[model samples]
Target chain A: YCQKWMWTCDSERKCCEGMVCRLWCKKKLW
Target chain B: SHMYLRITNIVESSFFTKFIIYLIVLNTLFMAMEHHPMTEEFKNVLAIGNLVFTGIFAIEIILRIYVHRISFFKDPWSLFDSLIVTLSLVELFLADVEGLSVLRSFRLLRVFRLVTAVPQMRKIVSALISVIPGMLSVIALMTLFFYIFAIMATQLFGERFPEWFGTLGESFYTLFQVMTLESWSMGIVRPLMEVYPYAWVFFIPFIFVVTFVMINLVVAICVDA
Candidate 1:
């Protein structure tokens, strides 16, 4: 499980920030 | 926690939220009914409905402020809700004061509050807002294109087509209609091409550059945003 505050990214590169998914990256980071 | 905290919890509860949404939907229906030609009998009913709903909206915002205190204003959605509710109250009070019935139109803006009330709508609105600044420069570019084209059309076709390109103002108006691709060829461009023969060189390229290119840029920016 990812932490609530830090960036969270899955295989799709959709990044969740705070309570919302606000960004999509090209590659999975953290 | 204080009593205010208890009130805040209640406000955040799903049941209260559903209740609030019902009121908003009901208020919107009433406003829509007011748009049609009102019968003498039902006018009073519509007026009373407006007053009752406005009071409820005002009380709802007041309760939120009471619970959240100054922090209520920190949320953009909360601020918008409060502003709409407050404006409705002000419009009601100013109805008898004269010269303020125009403010009654603000009642229509209440329907837009659904953007804030619903999560998906709020996200879409926020995305649009984020794209606006970037879109503004493109809009300015389009305006510049319009200005230059207006001057050129006035110079090239002004004497021959006084009705369409008599002056810079007429050229701008016609160009706006053309940009929308609304009967432009049948109405203006084809007629001009008949006379000038090379008018397509001007009109076709202008349409391609401005409408196709600029509109696509705007849509791409919004989608990415």
Candidate 2:
């Protein structure tokens, strides 16, 4: 299972996914 | 704490931001270069330029993660930056694979980094995202209308305009031209009207619904969103 925006909870690579994270950042930041 | 703070401040500085902006601009030019027929011979040079920029982006992201530490992964923009850099690296590594060459085109998507890099662009993108759900409903309504029109066209004109209305699919294709207002009267509707004067009954309302009502609804929904 993974989070949709800002972060990813994937076990293999414990990093946030790119596309969703960008949108969330834009939504919040500016 | 001093060292960490120093590096973080440097990365966040206006100079660093300017450098990143230049990199995004140059890469966008490179992407456009990839398409020009004149640059066909310089393809190898363009590929190398792409690789060089990908490296810079990867290093920048690593610096970001180092500066922010675990908190780096918390924000969306940093993750997006890292993801595109990683994809570029992966594409480079798999270059020898037969079908992977097609994936090279995806590297152009890195140009979209401009959207995240600029504040105004980000606002526009955010607004578009905010309107997706509303747009989808309008799309569903449009599809339903198209299905009904396609069926009617197929039934009413199938015998006469066999080439255009013989199949449900063909009717849908012709209606799409009508929706676009692309030569609809002289090219399609007029010809059909010549055969069946009542054909206007079916087409005129269709143009009104698809070109006028549905489009207006889309504009209103987007503006509301």
Best by DockQ: 2
Please identify model 1 stretches exceeding 4 Å from their true place: A1-30, B96-101, B133-136, B150-173, B190-201, B218-225
Q: Which run of 10 residues does model 1 chain B get worst, by summed lDDT?
A: B92-101
Q: Each candidate's TM vs. the true structure?
A: 0.68, 0.65
Alpha carbon deviation, residue B187, candidate 1 (Å)? 3.2
Candidate 2 Cα misplacement greater than 4 A, ranges = A1-30, B1-3, B39-41, B66-80, B95-101, B131-136, B147-174, B190-200, B218-225
- Cα lDDT listed for each candidate: 0.74, 0.74
> First chain of model 1: TM-score?
0.22
Report fnat, model 2: 0.00
Chain A TM-scores of each predicted structure, in the order given, are 0.22, 0.18
lDDT of 1 by residue, A1-30 (tens): 442322444455443332323221111222
